[PDB]
Amino acid sequence: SQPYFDNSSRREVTATVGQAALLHCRVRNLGDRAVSWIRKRDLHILTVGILTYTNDQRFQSLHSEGSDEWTLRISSPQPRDSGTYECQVSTEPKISQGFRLNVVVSRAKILGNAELFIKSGSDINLTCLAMQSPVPPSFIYWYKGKRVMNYSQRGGINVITERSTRTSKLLIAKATPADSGNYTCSPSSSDSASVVVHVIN
Amino acid sequence: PAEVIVDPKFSSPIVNMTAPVGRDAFLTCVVQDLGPYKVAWLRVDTQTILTIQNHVITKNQRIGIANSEHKTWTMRIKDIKESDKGWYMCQINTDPMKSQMGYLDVVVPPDILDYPTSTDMVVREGSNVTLKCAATGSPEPTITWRRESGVPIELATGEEVMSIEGTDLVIPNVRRHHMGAYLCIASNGVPPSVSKRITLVVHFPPMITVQNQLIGAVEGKGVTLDCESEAYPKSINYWTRERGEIVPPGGKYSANVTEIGGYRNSMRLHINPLTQAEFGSYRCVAKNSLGDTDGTIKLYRIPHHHHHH
Numbered sequence: 001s002q003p004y005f006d007n008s009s010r011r012e013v014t015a016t017v018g019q020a021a022l023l024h025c026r027v028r029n030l031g032d033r034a035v036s037w038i039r040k041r042d043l044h045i046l047t048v049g050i051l052t053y054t055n056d057q058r059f060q061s062l063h064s065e066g067s068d069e070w071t072l073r074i075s076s077p078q079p080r081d082s083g084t085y086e087c088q089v090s091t092e093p094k095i096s097q098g099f100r101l102n103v104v105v106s107r108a109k110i111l112g113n114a115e116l117f118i119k120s121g122s123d124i125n126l127t128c129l130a131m132q133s134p135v136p137p138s139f140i141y142w143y144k145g146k147r148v149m150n151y152s153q154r155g156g157i158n159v160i161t162e163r164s165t166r167t168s169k170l171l172i173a174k175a176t177p178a179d180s181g182n183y184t185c186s187p188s189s190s191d192s193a194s195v196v197v198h199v200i201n
Numbered sequence: 202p203a204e205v206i207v208d209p210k211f212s213s214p215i216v217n218m219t220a221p222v223g224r225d226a227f228l229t230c231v232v233q234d235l236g237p238y239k240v241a242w243l244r245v246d247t248q249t250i251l252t253i254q255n256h257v258i259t260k261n262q263r264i265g266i267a268n269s270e271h272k273t274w275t276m277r278i279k280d281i282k283e284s285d286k287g288w289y290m291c292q293i294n295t296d297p298m299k300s301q302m303g304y305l306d307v308v309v310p311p312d313i314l315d316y317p318t319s320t321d322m323v324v325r326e327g328s329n330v331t332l333k334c335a336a337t338g339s340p341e342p343t344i345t346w347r348r349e350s351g352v353p354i355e356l357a358t359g360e361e362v363m364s365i366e367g368t369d370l371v372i373p374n375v376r377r378h379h380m381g382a383y384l385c386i387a388s389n390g391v392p393p394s395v396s397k398r399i400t401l402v403v404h405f406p407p408m409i410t411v412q413n414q415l416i417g418a419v420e421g422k423g424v425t426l427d428c429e430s431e432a433y434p435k436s437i438n439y440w441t442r443e444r445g446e447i448v449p450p451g452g453k454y455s456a457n458v459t460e461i462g463g464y465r466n467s468m469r470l471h472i473n474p475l476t477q478a479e480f481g482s483y484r485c486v487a488k489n490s491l492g493d494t495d496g497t498i499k500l501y502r503i504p505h506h507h508h509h510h
């Protein structure tokens with residue numbers, strides 16, 4: 001007879017450039033009414049039910065049949081997309097719920113020169129920082145060019161990853177000609193950052 | 202193969218619409234080369250979705266939509282309410298998004314409000330009072346004050362006029378003549394106009410006007426003492442004599458007090474037949490709820506005849 005919201009959707013949502021943002025809106029006893037997403041800034045419609053209206057392919061409605069959750073998915077968020085998005089139900093008067101999405105740029109960096117030149121036999125020390133992200137990363141990838149690095153793939157590899165300090169130190173002992181290439185540090189909740197290495201002898 | 206899609210545009214801005222309350226209104230939005238894109242109607246201030254293509258999203262059963270050749274998209278609102286007035290938006294899901302707006306206005310005939318409007322005023326002469334009249338309607342009604350029976354009204358400058366506009370008829374220093382029935386008129390161009398009857402009652406202490414302060418008469422004949430009182434509320438009129446002794450009803454004395462409209466009394470005292478004991482100064486008195494007043498009449502004797510010696 002009367003729909004109402006869930007109360008546990010986390011009005012404040014913080015996403016990072018790239019990846020994707022989710023705004024979850026749950027409604028109890030929907031009925032024949034419909035749930036819609038709008039952008040308060042310019043009053044632009046986004047989704048109605050499961051169909052998309054916006055013609056900005058980045059916006060998509062997610063709803064599992066019979067569920068109470070209507071999720072607004074924003075692909076490839078950008079800083080301009082920071083604003084208030086309202087969950088709306090077709091009743092009269094309509095019942096709304098104002099979500100506030102805030103996207104931030106989170107970049108990772110590797111201390112030192114972007115391009116390193118070390119003599120064969122000397123060590124490699126790549127310290128990576130992901131200080132911009134709001135939440136500490138849950139994992140940090142180390143890509144040797146394109147394939148994932150594994151401390152066991154080569155002797156003399158020391159990898160210390162600390163989500164407490166948002167750092168990851170990759171240490172390669174006694175460099176060799178084969179060890180050349182762009183090493184990439186890709187944390188979970190942040191952007192990528194690479195450093196190209198060249199050797200001699 | 203596939204084909205190229207054209208850029209849909211608004212053929213013209215939304216035309217403003219004024220509609221009578223309780224009737225139907227039609228917001229239309231014309232587009233060109235809509236093609237695969239969709240038109241939407243939204244209430245701006247509430248930011249509520251109303252229609253998309255030919256579907257009415259809102260549960261408001263008074264809302265409907267219909268299109269002609271996918272060019273003219275018309276939203277219908279049944280049983281218009283004053284709530285329905287405001288801005289509406291016509292939105293196309295282009296990239297970027299396009300939108301137009303148009304205003305729907307609801308006209309309502311004027312209606313005078315009991316509470317904020319003066320009832321029956323009762324003010325003492327000399328003080329000030331403001332007759333008030335408040336009405337509702339669309340547009341904002343105009344309030345015109347008129348005195349019943351063509352009696353004019355005087356502004357602060359002393360100029361006399363037949364009507365005064367404004368919800369407040371400020372009367373500084375009320376007077377006897379301001380008492381009467383006043384007409385409040387509310388009009389806004391939306392028939393019918395309405396009016397309310399507001400009475401103004403002015404209290405004042407009695408005022409005696411002696412017709413003749415000196416009166417000579419001969420012995421054995423009759424005499425009539427005349428006074429006229431003006432007082433509201435109504436007053437009691439009686440005659441006294443000398444120190445204030447009330448006149449005796451019996452014997453030579455006879456009285457006749459008659460009201461003559463305008464809240465004035467005509468009080469007459471007839472003495473007959475005159476003797477020395479009935480000559481002297483008399484007083485005509487009138488009193489009401491505010492006080493009393495008197496006028497003195499001196500009745501002296503003049504001889505029947507006089508000889509020049």
Ligand SMILES: *[C@@H]1O[C@H](CO[C@@H]2O[C@@H](C)[C@@H](O)[C@@H](O)[C@@H]2O)[C@@H](O[C@@H]2O[C@H](CO)[C@@H](O[C@@H]3O[C@H](CO[C@H]4O[C@H](CO)[C@@H](O)[C@H](O)[C@@H]4O[C@@H]4O[C@H](CO)[C@@H](O)[C@H](O)[C@H]4NC(C)=O)[C@@H](O)[C@H](O[C@H]4O[C@H](CO)[C@@H](O)[C@H](O)[C@@H]4O[C@@H]4O[C@H](CO)[C@@H](O)[C@H](O)[C@H]4NC(C)=O)[C@@H]3O)[C@H](O)[C@H]2NC(C)=O)[C@H](O)[C@H]1NC(C)=O
Binds near residue numbers: 457458459460461467
């Ligand atoms: C106590 O005192 C009061 C007050 O006395 C009066 O006031 C004081 C201050 C002094 O000036 C006094 O001199 C004065 O008399 C006495 O009350 C008065 O009593 C007399 C009679 O004794 C009445 O006279 C009659 O008046 C009517 C006309 O009345 C209208 O006009 C008056 C002014 O002209 C006005 O004052 C009245 O209020 C009334 O006003 C009219 O009202 C109508 C309706 O609202 C309105 O449409 C008019 O516009 C309005 N007019 C005005 C001017 O405002 C008059 O018609 C009577 O004459 C008939 O009777 C006479 C004989 O009695 C006769 O000679 C006439 O020809 C006429 O005869 C009639 O004719 C018709 C037509 O053909 C016929 O059909 C009838 O059959 C015929 N009738 C008869 C009997 O023949 C008469 O003159 C005063 O009106 C009255 N005043 C007040 C204020 O009450 C009171 O009597 C005293 N009591 C005691 C015990 O002493």
Ligand SMILES: *[C@@H]1O[C@H](CO[C@@H]2O[C@@H](C)[C@@H](O)[C@@H](O)[C@@H]2O)[C@@H](O[C@@H]2O[C@H](CO)[C@@H](O[C@@H]3O[C@H](CO)[C@@H](O)[C@H](O[C@H]4O[C@H](CO)[C@@H](O)[C@H](O)[C@@H]4O)[C@@H]3O)[C@H](O)[C@H]2NC(C)=O)[C@H](O)[C@H]1NC(C)=O
Binds near residue numbers: 218305306
């Ligand atoms: C369509 O209708 C809307 C709404 O107006 C209402 O409906 C109409 C159908 C009609 O019945 C109106 O009587 C009724 O109110 C119109 O929107 C209004 O537009 C006017 C003019 O732009 C606005 O008035 C302005 O308000 C400003 C403050 O917000 C004020 O600063 C402006 O004053 C300036 O300009 C005037 C000249 O107009 C100048 O004299 C001043 O000195 C100053 O420079 C001006 O008063 C209203 O606020 C608008 N109403 C709303 C609700 O927004 C719309 O214009 C109309 N469109 C067409 C094409 O007719």
Ligand SMILES: *[C@@H]1O[C@H](CO[C@@H]2O[C@@H](C)[C@@H](O)[C@@H](O)[C@@H]2O)[C@@H](O[C@@H]2O[C@H](CO)[C@@H](O[C@@H]3O[C@H](CO)[C@@H](O)[C@H](O)[C@@H]3O)[C@H](O)[C@H]2NC(C)=O)[C@H](O)[C@H]1NC(C)=O
Binds near residue numbers: 183
């Ligand atoms: C060493 O490698 C890094 C990236 O490491 C890997 O490279 C990819 C090919 C994959 O293997 C991934 O697993 C991983 O990123 C190079 O930096 C990155 O280079 C790529 C391609 O040159 C950049 O991609 C571009 O990204 C922009 C972003 O807008 C797109 O618009 C482009 O279309 C294109 O996809 C990527 O941005 C870049 N990363 C950065 C700059 O942080 C690195 O350049 C390489 N070494 C050298 C010397 O080039």
Ligand SMILES: *[C@@H]1O[C@H](CO[C@@H]2O[C@@H](C)[C@@H](O)[C@@H](O)[C@@H]2O)[C@@H](O[C@@H]2O[C@H](CO)[C@@H](O)[C@H](O)[C@H]2NC(C)=O)[C@H](O)[C@H]1NC(C)=O
Binds near residue numbers: 112127167169
């Ligand atoms: C690997 O290098 C990191 C940082 O690289 C260096 O940092 C400066 C000290 C300077 O030498 C720069 O030119 C290099 O890019 C080392 O981490 C820092 O170490 C210093 C000294 O021990 C310390 O004061 C800082 O706090 C450290 N920073 C962080 C983020 O921990 C690290 O010790 C080196 N590891 C090895 C094994 O050589």
Ligand SMILES: *[C@@H]1O[C@H](CO)[C@@H](O)[C@H](O)[C@H]1NC(C)=O
Binds near residue numbers: 373
């Ligand atoms: C009426 O006049 C008196 C005397 O100046 C003043 O005290 C009072 O406020 C006035 N009231 C109104 C309604 O003007």
